[PDB]
Ligand binder design. Structure first.
Ligand code: KGM
Length: 158
């Protein structure tokens, strides 16, 4: 089991870390949702699917910077919604093919009532998402750590 970003940065068997650099919608009002669909950015596959089945969760999702200070969040994992920053590990998704498949994570972020000006700065860390991979074969329990960066400023008009 291994993963890569859309730009080709890999995290190999056994886990590790990578940075994800994403363009964000440039403006969001109070009462609107800013969505970041990381299923377009992070892909994984099972290396031996006719022998082993891989199980994959969002173990934890943490917010940083302007997301932490100025937004209320949910994360959708495999179509189901949970608080973000997270308060539990999600259910699992099965990876059963050598063909890369998206990691089905999207952030839904809405400004807090006192948010204003530039709320997320260009280049800043917005989230750390931990993908946890286990299987039906042995005791493997590996963390794939995705450090999510905003490419651009996001403004919240008042
Ligand atoms: C008959 C023995 C087959 C032994 C192949 C081991 C391959 O392990 C790798 O690939 C497996 C399949 O993706 C993962 O479950 C595991 O964590 C690791 O990434």
């Amino acid at each position: 089991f291994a993963c890569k970003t859309a730009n080709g940065t890999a995290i190999p068997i056994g886990g590790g870390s990578a940075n994800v650099y994403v363009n964000l919608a440039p403006a969001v009002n109070v009462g609107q949702n800013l969505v970041v669909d990381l299923s377009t950015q992070i892909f994984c596959h099972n290396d031996y699917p006719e022998t082993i089945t891989d199980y994959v969760t969002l173990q934890r999702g943490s917010a940083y910077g302007g997301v932490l200070s100025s937004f209320s969040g949910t994360v959708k994992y495999n179509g189901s919604s949970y608080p973000f920053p997270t308060t539990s590990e999600t259910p699992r998704v099965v990876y059963n093919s050598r063909t890369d498949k998206p990691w089905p994570v999207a952030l839904y972020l809405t400004p807090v009532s006192s948010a204003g000006g530039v709320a997320i700065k260009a280049g800043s860390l917005i989230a750390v998402l931990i993908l946890r991979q286990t299987n039906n074969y042995n005791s493997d329990d590996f963390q794939f750590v995705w450090n999510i960066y905003a490419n651009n400023d996001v403004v919240v008009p008042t």
